[PDB]
Design a protein around this ligand. Structure first.
Ligand SMILES: [Mg+2]
Ligand SMILES: [Mg+2]
Ligand SMILES: [Mg+2]
Ligand SMILES: [Mg+2]
Ligand SMILES: [Mg+2]
Ligand SMILES: [Mg+2]
Ligand SMILES: [Mg+2]
Ligand SMILES: [Mg+2]
Ligand SMILES: [Mg+2]
Ligand SMILES: [Mg+2]
Ligand SMILES: [Mg+2]
Length: 1282
RNA sequence: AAUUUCUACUGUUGUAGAUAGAUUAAAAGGUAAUUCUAU
DNA sequence: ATAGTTCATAGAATTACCTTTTAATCTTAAAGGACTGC
DNA sequence: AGTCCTTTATCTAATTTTCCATTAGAACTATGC
């Protein structure tokens, strides 16, 4: 008897099914004659362009109105005081008094944006296509901007100029409703409600707390480290960002530069509502790069960082400013320098070729080439011809880089020069010199931009001779490093020569051929070349004089040397912008061009299936001989399936779908029964008008316009329900639904009546139509007919159909239609996927033709099969929404009902615990109530008994590819998809086990308590598996189950609620529980003993003290092993006493018993007849003795055996049971684990068993405690079997 | 190597399992490059 | 003969490209604006 | 009346985080025998 038999039809959920649309007959010829495919392809792009133009209008409106909005300082200060008070302590009245001020601010902003004249036309047809007598506000604004000569679409290439925007907007005249969905999104931008999409939310809920945090941080920064912020230098640097138009604290209108104290005043918060003000604030927080300047102008955070680092006080880290979040629709260029982009491959080719011919063409004052100049100079540095008192390294990242490159350490040069100057200067009393001696010494070693090579050579000569000859660490190594630099040009030349053909490939203006995966190899070569040059630039970057603030103390340097050098370096430094530009171009995602929406000249296409809307929506469904068909009638031929046309063409060929639906009763009934056109028909009693105007029929429903909400009255509600029933009986056609309502008195709220209305207000019927008529209208072109198709719908299909096939076929089943579970939903869409790749027969017919375990290794096919056949030709596609459990309310308090069920059916429940392992990808163990395992197998191999697939070997090869080329520019990745496919294979097996064994599922909590180690299955992938299991158990049907019994198509298992977020998974998502994985693996399954001693060898004295506090180490005479005894409370602090034994052989085979016997024989201690060694070993003094003793002690505690041979990895226990024999997974029964990862899974299951016990004793009144402590887990697992 | 689509496959013009789409917005992270610093 | 440690690392910025996750609207027939036709 | 194209009507419930916690392979060192 299945425990989950009653958990069926519990809550409703929505799903979208997808099919191919095979054109039937001459419909494709008719479509292509009318040019509808190309028209829709053009309309998709024009639709995106129109949305972009409307978005630009929205951006401008948001900017203007937010720069007009002024929030009074008193509201801001009240909000600030209460918000900061809330941090100290919580109170209900304080939270409500806070929300009061918050909502007042929000209401002021919302009333401002509602009063604005421009807002009122945003969502009407007045925006796009205006009624006669007035012109649309979008076209008005566009024409005004054009007459004002401003270019609006400089940014994007897709919109040429304002005229093209005008004609694009013009194109959609008469298609306003095509934007309805879009408009909804844009309504969300200005919502008064508490949704994160609105600018009001972004101002009040997000950026105001951030600005108050930053203000508090600035006020705190002024008391400690007041000179940390360089006020002078930011007033110099961020002048544009410190310029504001009006100061709100003083309410003065002036364009003066602002001060930080002025900027961080609360009343000035207004200047940060507009997006431009947000960029100003974020820039004064983070600084900017200027076009000409080499050093970035610093922001507040950088000053905080620099002062905190010079003081070595990480207390000030906490005063870091948080940048403000952006405005909702903003698209703004950065105040920092933005580099020019590249448009296509030809740009890359031309720029790269220009630079690389430049470097070879360049000559200096002399007639020496760039390579010639550098080679001459560096071979001249080979010899000692140059004076090292005039050549200077830059004491920067390049100096430490060259140090790490030459000596494999970054500090050797720094310590060497520091020691040289300390030895030369202030030599008397070296260790602690005088104050002036240190400050002089300070300059020579740090706070010196450059170091002469002479200083370096003397420092190294001293440091080397001081240390021994083992480490060479010679200055000649640095000289030879530089000597080697000229040789790079020849590798560059080889790559540049071989690059000719690759350049020919992309020499043409053809767009975006590099972004595709097919360019991968060619993308590598290119990058490598650049890298070389870039590396060269970084290699000789050290000599470059950074040209910054040598007020005094100029370097005495070789002028000719540095002249030719700086010329070469200035020519080479042009690669930084080139490298950045072509990296920005090449790393883009290749395409965004898969499919587009098909409309068939109907903006409202397939928006609703009802017959009354069939002319306006032009979407019909047909069935014939167990095949399903979609029909789109010509827009002009609007009435092809009128009532009069049905009877004339009645026959036996096809079956038309007649769809009737009453959607949204709460909206529809008051809409029809009080409409100005029909309020008189359903004549409302004056009492009913009162009961509607004041929402007395609804607890929280909105009242009529200008009226006020009054308290819910049950009699008013039931009277309104009686009026609804009478009006329904009055309705001209809704009585076709045949409504059977409950007694009015049984309704306790109007939503129950609304639910009955919506549940019964949807039916499907079938009108027969002769095959000849549909054939005639398809040949005539007035109707476009498509077969709704997939694999399972072919005649050759004999296997178990896809789940969506079953859902679709159930949509129109009669067993469904008697008590509707599957309900066809309204807004379906149609798409068109052009050909992506050319046809290519990868496997010719009649040849032998990957999985190793398939017996038929050379399976021959009569037919030749094409690779990726679905992308070779253009195709039509149909996305159809449906609702399942159509008459169920929805998931509410699902965990509570699951826990109630499990509490009542506890005795039958099993616990399937899963774990990811070091050797296994994932292993499962299902345990009965007492603690014994019932079944265990692995998920390394997913396979039917006919032929089985090994995913362990298939996943073994994948991880090597990423780590090898993770930083490469172009790299195709099918890895995520393949891992998800394996997990989708696994979820079905998990569901099978759950249903057959009546088990709950136990997982490792991945938000908290997750394992720190390294495993075959990554953590994120395991989280994906958990989410996939939740989603699968939302609606679980088994294809083999009958159509009406539980688990079948009509009666689906619903064991999990809908997924919300990873964090909200918590510790229970339906029948899936999540426990910390702490101490699940290194623990004994029979006694629950985990190695918590962690004994490391230290000084002999400390090891004496360690072994002092053992209880007993006496040798066991009987069974021939050693016995330790102790209490964990006496050690450095768990509880209990254990008997450690040295039986068996662990692996590092190293048998501890023999090792201990030999160690004790070689020393004085005799263990002949039960001698208690504890006192004997504390008296020993040699280091080797305690070393080997602690080593053998650690080897004893190795429950896990680490065989480097990967066939088996097993587990053995160090503590004997009451019987006296130790547990070994080598020889273990079925009821106990059979390897080590199995022990991890089994103890995950024991945590789940603690949870099952906690569920068993849960009173209905109070909350269930699902946090398992290590104390409770230890107690349970240690005394579980007593 | 056929797919509504995806992952494995031949599992024979397809076999297994999975599959909520469309639209819109934002935040977070990754990796380069660049300016500083501190060890 | 083995271990252990390191390939410098890490904090504040800016730009660019990529991805992932969460959070919103909808999954509708019929009234209403217009205009036309009888 | 019909048609096309856009705008409208507006339930219901429970929530708001809880705190639980022992690249890689290679290379140069660095010990110990
Ligand atoms: Mg303003
Ligand atoms: Mg343009
Ligand atoms: Mg739509
Ligand atoms: Mg945008
Ligand atoms: Mg310095
Ligand atoms: Mg149209
Ligand atoms: Mg229409
Ligand atoms: Mg409520
Ligand atoms: Mg199938
Ligand atoms: Mg593709
Ligand atoms: Mg494939």
């Amino acid at each position: 008897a299945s425990i989950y038999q009653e958990f069926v039809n519990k809550y409703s959920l929505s799903k979208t099914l997808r099919f191919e649309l095979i054109p039937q007959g001459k419909t494709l010829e008719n479509i292509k004659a009318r040019g509808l495919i190309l028209d829709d392809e053009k309309r998709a792009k024009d639709y995106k362009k129109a949305k972009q133009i409307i978005d630009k209008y929205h951006q401008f409106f948001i900017e203007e109105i937010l720069s007009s909005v002024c929030i009074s300082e008193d509201l801001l200060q009240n909000y600030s005081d209460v918000y900061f008070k809330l941090k100290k302590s919580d109170d209900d009245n304080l939270q409500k008094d806070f929300k009061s001020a918050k909502d007042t601010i929000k209401k002021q902003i919302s009333e401002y944006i509602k009063d604005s004249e421009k807002f009122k036309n945003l969502f009407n047809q007045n925006l796009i296509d205006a009624k006669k007598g007035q012109e649309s506000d979008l076209i008005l604004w566009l024409k005004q901007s054009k007459d004002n000569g401003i270019e609006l679409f400089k940014a994007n290439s897709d919109i040429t100029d304002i005229d093209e925007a005008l004609e694009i907007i013009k194109s959609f005249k008469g298609w306003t409703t095509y934007f309805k969905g879009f408009h909804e999104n844009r309504k969300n931008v200005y919502s008064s409600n508490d949704i994160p999409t609105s600018i009001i939310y972004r101002i009040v809920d997000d950026n105001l707390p951030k600005f108050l945090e930053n203000k508090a941080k600035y006020e705190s920064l002024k008391d400690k480290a007041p000179e940390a912020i360089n006020y002078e230098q930011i007033k110099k640097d961020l002048a544009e960002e410190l310029t504001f138009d009006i100061d709100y604290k003083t309410s003065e209108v002036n364009q003066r530069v602002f001060s930080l104290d002025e900027v961080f005043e609360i009343a000035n918060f207004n200047n940060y509502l507009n997006q431009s003000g947000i960029t100003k604030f974020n820039t004064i927080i983070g600084g900017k790069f200027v076009n000409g300047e080499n050093t970035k102008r610093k922001g507040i955070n950088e000053y905080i960082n620099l002062y905190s680092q010079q003081i070595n006080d990480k207390t000030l880290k906490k005063y870091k400013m948080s940048v403000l979040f952006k405005q909702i629709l903003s698209d703004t260029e950065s105040k920092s320098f933005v580099i020019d982009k590249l448009e296509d491959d030809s740009d890359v080719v031309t720029t790269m070729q220009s630079f690389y011919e430049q470097i070879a063409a360049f000559k200096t004052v002399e007639e020496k080439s760039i390579k010639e100049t550098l080679s001459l100079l560096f071979d001249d540095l080979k010899a000692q011809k140059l004076d090292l008192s005039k050549i200077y390294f830059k004491n920067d990242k390049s100096l430490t880089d060259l140090s790490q490159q030459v000596f494999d350490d970054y500090s050797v040069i720094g310590t060497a020069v520091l020691e040289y100057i300390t030895q030369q200067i202030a030599p008397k009393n070296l260790d602690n010199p005088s104050k002036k001696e240190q400050e002089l010494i300070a300059k020579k070693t740090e706070k010196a931009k450059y170091l002469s090579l002479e200083t370096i050579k003397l420092a190294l000569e001293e440091f080397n001779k001081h240390r021994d000859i083992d480490k060479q660490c010679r200055f000649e190594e640095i000289l030879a490093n530089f000597a080697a630099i000229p040789m790079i040009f020849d590798e560059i030349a080889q790559n540049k020569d071989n690059l000719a053909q690759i350049s020919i490939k992309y020499q043409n203006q053809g767009k975006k051929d590099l972004l595709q995966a097919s360019a991968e190899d060619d993308v590598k070569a290119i990058k490598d070349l650049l890298d070389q040059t870039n590396n060269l630039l970084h290699k000789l970057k050290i000599f470059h004089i950074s040209q910054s603030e040598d007020k005094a103390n100029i370097l005495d340097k070789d002028e000719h040397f540095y002249l030719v050098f700086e010329e070469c370096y200035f020519e080479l430094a042009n690669i930084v912008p080139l490298y950045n530009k072509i990296r920005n171009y090449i790393t883009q995602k290749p395409y965004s061009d898969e499919k587009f929406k098909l409309n068939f000249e109907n903006s409202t296409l397939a928006n609703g299936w009802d017959k009354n809307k069939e002319p306006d929506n032009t979407a019909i469904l047909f069935i014939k001989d167990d095949k399903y068909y979609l029909g789109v009638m010509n827009k002009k031929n609007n009435k092809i399936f009128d009532d009069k046309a049905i009877k004339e063409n009645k026959g036996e060929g096809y079956k038309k779908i007649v769809y009737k639906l009453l959607p949204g009763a709460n909206k529809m009934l008051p809409k029809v029964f009080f409409s100005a056109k029909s309020i008189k028909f359903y004549n409302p009693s004056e009492d009913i008008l009162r009961i509607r105007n004041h929402s007395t029929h609804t607890k929280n429903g909105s009242p009529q316009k200008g009226y006020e909400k009054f308290e819910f009255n049950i009699e008013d509600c039931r009277k309104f329900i009686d009026f609804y029933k009478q009006s329904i009986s009055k309705h001209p056609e809704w009585k076709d639904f045949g409504f059977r309502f409950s007694d009015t008195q049984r309704y306790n709220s109007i939503d129950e009546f609304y639910r009955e209305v919506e549940n019964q207000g949807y039916k499907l019927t079938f009108e027969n139509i002769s095959e000849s008529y549909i054939d005639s209208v398809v040949n005539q072109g007035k109707l476009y007919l498509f077969q709704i198709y997939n694999k399972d719908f072919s005649a050759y299909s004999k296997g178990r159909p896809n789940l969506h096939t079953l859902y679709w076929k159930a949509l129109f089943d009669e067993r469904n239609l008697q008590d509707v579970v599957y309900k066809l939903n309204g807004e379906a869409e149609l798409f068109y996927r052009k050909q992506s790749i050319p046809k290519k027969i990868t496997h010719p017919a009649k040849e032998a033709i990957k999985n190793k375990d398939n017996p038929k290794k050379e399976s021959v096919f009569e037919y030749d099969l094409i690779k990726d056949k679905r992308f070779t030709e253009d195709k039509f596609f149909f996305h159809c929404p449906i609702t399942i459990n159509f008459k169920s309310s929805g998931a509410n308090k699902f965990n509570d009902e699951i826990n109630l069920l499990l509490k009542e059916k506890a005795n039958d429940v099993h616990i399937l615990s899963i774990d990811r392992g070091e050797r296994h990808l994932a292993y499962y163990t299902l345990v009965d109530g007492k603690g014994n395992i019932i079944k265990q197998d692995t998920f390394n191999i997913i396979g039917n008994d006919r032929m089985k697939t090994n995913y362990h070997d298939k996943l073994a090869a994948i991880e090597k590819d990423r780590d090898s080329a993770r930083k490469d520019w172009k790299k195709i990745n099918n890895i995520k998809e393949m891992k998800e496919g394996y997990l989708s294979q696994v979820v079905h097996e998990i569901a099978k086990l759950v249903i057959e064994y009546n088990a709950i599922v136990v997982f490792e909590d991945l938000n908290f308590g997750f394992k720190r180690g390294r495993f075959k299955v990554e953590k994120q992938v395991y989280q994906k598996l958990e989410k996939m299991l939740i989603e699968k158990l939302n609606y679980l049907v088994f294809k083999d189950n009958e159509f009406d019994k539980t688990g079948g198509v009509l009666r689906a298992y619903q064991l999990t609620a809908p997924f919300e977020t990873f964090k909200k998974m918590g510790k229970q998502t339906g029948i899936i529980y999540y426990v910390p994985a702490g101490f699940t693996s290194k623990i004994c399954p029979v006694t629950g003993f985990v190695n918590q001693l962690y004994p490391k060898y230290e000084s002999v004295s400390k090891s004496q003290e360690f072994f002092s506090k053992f209880d007993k180490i006496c040798y066991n005479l009987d069974k021939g092993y050693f016995e330790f005894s102790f209490d964990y409370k006496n050690f450095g602090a768990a509880k209990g006493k254990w008997t450690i034994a040295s039986f068996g052989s662990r692996l590092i085979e190293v048998y501890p018993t023999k090792e201990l016997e030999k160690l004790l024989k070689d020393y004085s201690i005799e263990y002949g007849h039960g001698e208690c060694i504890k006192a004997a070993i504390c008296g020993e003094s040699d280091k080797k003795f305690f070393a080997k003793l602690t080593s053998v002690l650690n080897t004893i505690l190795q429950m896990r055996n680490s065989k480097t041979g990967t066939e088996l990895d097993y587990l053995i226990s160090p503590v004997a049971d009451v019987n006296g024999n130790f547990f070994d997974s080598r020889q273990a029964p079925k009821n106990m684990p059979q390897d080590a990862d199995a022990n991890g899974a089994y103890h995950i299951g024991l945590k789940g068993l603690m949870l099952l016990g906690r569920i068993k004793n849960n009173q209905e009144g109070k909350k269930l405690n699902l946090v398992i402590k290590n104390e409770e887990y230890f107690e349970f697992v240690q005394n579980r079997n007593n």
